[PDB]
Nucleic acid binder design. Sequence first.
RNA 1: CCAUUUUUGGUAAGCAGAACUGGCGAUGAGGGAUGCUCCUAACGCUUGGAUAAGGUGCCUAAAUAUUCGCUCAUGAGAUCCC
RNA 2: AAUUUAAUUUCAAUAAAGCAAUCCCCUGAAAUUGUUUUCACUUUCUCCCCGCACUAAUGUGGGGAAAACUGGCUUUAUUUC
Lengths: 146, 185, 121, 201, 180
Amino acid sequence: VELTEEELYISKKNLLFKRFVEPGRLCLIEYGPYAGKLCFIVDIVTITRVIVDGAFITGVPRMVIPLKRLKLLKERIKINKNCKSGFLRKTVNSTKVLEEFNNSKLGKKMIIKKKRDEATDFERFQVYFAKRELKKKMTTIKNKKN
Amino acid sequence: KTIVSTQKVLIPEGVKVAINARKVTVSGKYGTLRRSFRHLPIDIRLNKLKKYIKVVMWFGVPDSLACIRTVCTHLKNMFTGVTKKFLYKMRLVHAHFPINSNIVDNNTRIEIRNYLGEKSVRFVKALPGVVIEKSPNVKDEIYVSGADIENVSLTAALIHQSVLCRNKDIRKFLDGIYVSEVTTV
Amino acid sequence: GRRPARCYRYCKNKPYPKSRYCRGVPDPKIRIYDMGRKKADVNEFSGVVHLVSYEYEQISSEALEAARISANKYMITNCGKDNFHLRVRIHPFHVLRINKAFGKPNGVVARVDIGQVLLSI
Amino acid sequence: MYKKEYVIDCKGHLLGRLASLIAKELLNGQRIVAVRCEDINISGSLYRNKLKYQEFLRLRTNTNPKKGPLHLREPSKILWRCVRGMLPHKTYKGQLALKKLKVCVGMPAPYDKKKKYVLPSALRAFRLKKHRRYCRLGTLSSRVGWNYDTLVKKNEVLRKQVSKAYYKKKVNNLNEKKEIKTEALNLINPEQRQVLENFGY
Amino acid sequence: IDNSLNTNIHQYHIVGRAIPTAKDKNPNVYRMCIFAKNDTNAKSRFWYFMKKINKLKKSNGELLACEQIKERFPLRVKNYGVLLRYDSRTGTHNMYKEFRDTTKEGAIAQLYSEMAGRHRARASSINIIRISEISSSLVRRPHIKQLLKRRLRFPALHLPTLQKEYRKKFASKRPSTYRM
RNA sequence: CCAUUUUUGGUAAGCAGAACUGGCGAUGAGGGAUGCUCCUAACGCUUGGAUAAGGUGCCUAAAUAUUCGCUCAUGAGAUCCC
RNA sequence: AAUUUAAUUUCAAUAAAGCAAUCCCCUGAAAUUGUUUUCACUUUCUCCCCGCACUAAUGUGGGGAAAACUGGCUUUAUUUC
């Protein structure tokens, strides 16, 4: 009869360590030609090496790589013993993990950098122009405020 | 070597533990005791709700596992110390000479005169937070008591070493003050 | 004083045996060899133990005797005299000469190369 | 140039790599101000370093120590001496590079206004395993009797408290700036405001 | 082509026989699997074993077949047990060791890495006798037994090691070793 | 006269004496920190290329490269000839 | 950055079907100069029982059951999901 004590457990559960290297956790590749793509940890081969599989949106193929080349992300969805590309694709679509990642702060920092880098000279001038407009108004408020 | 190594360290009953900022600290009836582990690699955590302390190391190696037992044994002592107070009983042996025991500095420094009839003075102050008391129960016994297991043991050892004399034989020269009994009050 | 014997152990220089070319050769110190009960059979010698060399450096006559006598005493003290046979498998034969004109005969050692057995119990 | 001065906070860094990385840049021509020089780490133990320094102390010129080697006792000068070791100081390029390096115990006031940077590849817990023994250079210097640490510690605490008030002021001012900035996003042109939102700021 | 980078060494099935003669009109056929960096090395290793085992030599034999072996599944883990004979400074020693991998070739790579690392043993001084798949219950090694447990996780044990671009010499604020 | 391998005398010798070949001598550029003999390689004068021996933290030109091991030393250890 | 037609136990999905339930793709363990026959081995964020919160963990140690979601194979179409 295990179900009678649980309010206490939920109330007092806090632990500092997070983002555990447990199957089905989203991870950001930080080394090699696949860097900057996100991927799941499928299986764990041995202490330094894991079986990784990108989302089919990220497109990094299923492969063995060292865990050292990953930076693990907040999300995890519990998964079965092996992969399957279709079932992974269906589950990833179902749980909306990319959307959750993008909603998370690191995803926001990355997408802002990507857009900014690829922007045109006119777009860049528009951003400069907008900040220049903003500064004029802000200074006007600060003077008015005095 | 091991993937996971753990230890579950008995409830400190009636007393106030704190694990914050690596300097693990327990307060209780007889004192507050502080002891750093910042150099150790462990994730010591206070289990709290059901009390207990849980020590866990990730990817241990046999030295580290040993450190987990050393720390748990120290925590158990720390709890014991604040709850019930450590007593090191030191018996004074002498074949002949009177050894004059003057506890000075309000029960904090035993001054010793006349070991082996020396006519010279041996001073040993206690370490922080520990009492040096005398026995009314039996003539030669000396009580070294406190919350910390290390400071009483070190103080008692220092008292023994200070008395003990260099040179020639020792086998029939048994004279001196020796730790007899480790207890709590 | 009597040469370090360290020199003799190396197998260098052309092999020189006791011979008619010697015209006076010094005797080996080892002369006793084997000990124990010599007469025995396969049923009795249920155990046969061998001491195999691994270094493969030349071994002095005196060293062979000294090692053997030490062994004999350990056997006699432990298991009694008549209950074993200790056989000296190797025999000294390499005559060594020194100087202070080629040298003059002064040492006798055993020639030692791969897989040789020194003693057997 | 790359920057007017690189100012380096020596806290948490290992001696060799910090010196080695500085030396290649120093040769390239940057002027670099090392601050808090006492708080650099040597990777040997306290005893191990004491042993090495004792041996260094033993070295002498027998016929005349007046023209002998120098047993430099200041942590900045120790760092400087090590960097000189990693330079061709007998050359003119080496002499110039050696002049370019500046070393400072604790935090001096012309550099207390200034920014401080760190070298991530020279950080001790980046590059030395956690269970290994080690020693801080100022502590080592104090250990071999050359204590100028207590003064620096007093100076640092006084400076750090004043700095804390400066940091709270800077934070406060930024909060107010953010409030004014957020206010004036409504006051700018919509289309431009939308472009500014779209690529972020 | 792919994009794939690290780790190479291959598996070969080689079959050979003695040259036909008047004396023997039906030579014995000898087969072996061999782990090698290339086919020429694989032939040479086969020949070294053919020379050690039989009195056959390259000049007295013929190649019947040599073909590269590809593992059945590249991404499914197996426990491979390998028996090695290797040579020390003094002499010869036997060992049978266990490796978790998805590939026999990867297991051999781990084995060579171990023999080099733990004994200072050179490639020349190793002889691989049989590498084969071993059941999870049967396994001797505790380091492989730990992997085979019901559930496994870690809080990230490895330091960061960013791309060359972001390995720059100066940092604006002090960093941290890893997130909690 | 020097080196490898084979080798005789001599405790041994950067000792005495050889054999076969290659060097040095009479010949050098690059490496071996350094160096008559080791390694790579033999040279008109120049430009460009790509490499060898050999390296790639700094001195000092190239990686604070990757990958799996092992290693803490109150005198750790670091490359043939050395 | 690519690219052609070959070669050599490549695949992976797609959406409709089946087949067996430690059973199958596999891989184990067994009984002269042949084959073949035996039972061993998957999952689970399913359920129950004991420990009853005992955890490294949104759990958990032990004992059992459950299924085919999971995976495997046979198919039938499909390749710019």
